[PDB]
């Protein structure tokens with residue numbers, strides 16, 4: 001594994017699977033990610049898939065979730081499709097893909113999540129719907145008192161005042177968004193020990209992370225969710241569980257520019273989370289080695305985990321590279337990440 005270099009599939013073509021993630025099913029790894037074009041910032045083709053038995057050699061499986069050709073469709077060509085993730089639902093035997101969708105021609109304003117489903121890992125995936133998350137529902141961890149507070153929008157027009165920040169912390173944008181649903185941009189999925197799945201996403205104008213329970217078929221949200229680090233600008237979440245404890249790596253909010261990573265931890269998915277120092281160590285750790293978090297893959301056969309990141313190139317997004325590095329653990333069990341030029345499983 002040679003982070004930062006040009007990686008090619010088994011036909012000699014450049015691997016094009018950004019903002020991605022991996023699952024293992026019936027003996028093979030499947031890597032889903034954004035097909036990015038050589039120019040621009042929209043999705044021309046959709047979500048790409050690659051497969052491998054060894055994590056070194058990747059066969060192109062083609063587009064797993066294609067853009068629609070129907071005019072006015074949610075995923076019409078020219079929408080923005082980002083950070084796709086796939087989880088296998090054991091109950092229904094289906095593959096469920098969630099992704100960040102922004103409607104064609106509307107920049108990043110819509111802030112939706114979208115869901116699609118397939119009987120096979122590589123697709124084709126069938127689009128079901130898009131929208132903002134859990135319309136009408138409050139977070140479990142907003143008290144009755146906090147839920148009663150009202151916030152006149154004309155009094156809070158200026159961002160980053162003391163009163164505005166407090167208001168954001170106490171849930172002013174949760175209430176603003178309560179009718180039509182919570183905003184969802186950068187996102188991930190996690191399937192827990194008990195078969196419950198969670199949708200983790202940057203909400204409230206990117207200011208606040210939310211963690212939402214999915215229904216038993218993984219196709220919708222139950223209404224149960226929490227909100228964490230309000231005003232923190234945690235983005236690009238990646239998450240794993242080890243020995244009962246949850247660990248989440250996130251970026252800051254600086255568009256395509258790299259920034260300092262954060263480590264977050266909890267002893268229950270919907271309990272209280274705490275922030276720890278940057279998990280990246282050594283030279284360039286302050287810039288996440290020039291990358292941005294996308295996924296943490298468990299390798300449960302080994303009791304190991306590895307960290308996947310993107311090295312973004314906004315001038316030609318298809319030239320964006322991949323950083324994959326092992327997760328290491330200190331003598332207290334706290335995960336950390338060191339750069340290695342080349343490494344092996």
Ligand SMILES: OC[C@H]1O[C@@H](O)[C@H](O)[C@@H](O)[C@H]1O
Pocket residue numbers: 112113114115129130131132133134135181219220221
């Ligand atoms: O993100 C997709 C959304 O779809 C909506 O129809 C639903 O009301 C939301 O709770 C959410 O599941």
Ligand SMILES: OC[C@H]1O[C@@H](O)[C@H](O)[C@@H](O)[C@H]1O
Pocket residue numbers: 019082083186235236253254255256292
């Ligand atoms: O909007 C430009 C980019 O901003 C990043 O912060 C985000 O993680 C990406 O998925 C993309 O949306």
Ligand SMILES: [Ca+2]
Pocket residue numbers: 111183184185186202203204205206207
């Ligand atoms: Ca958001």
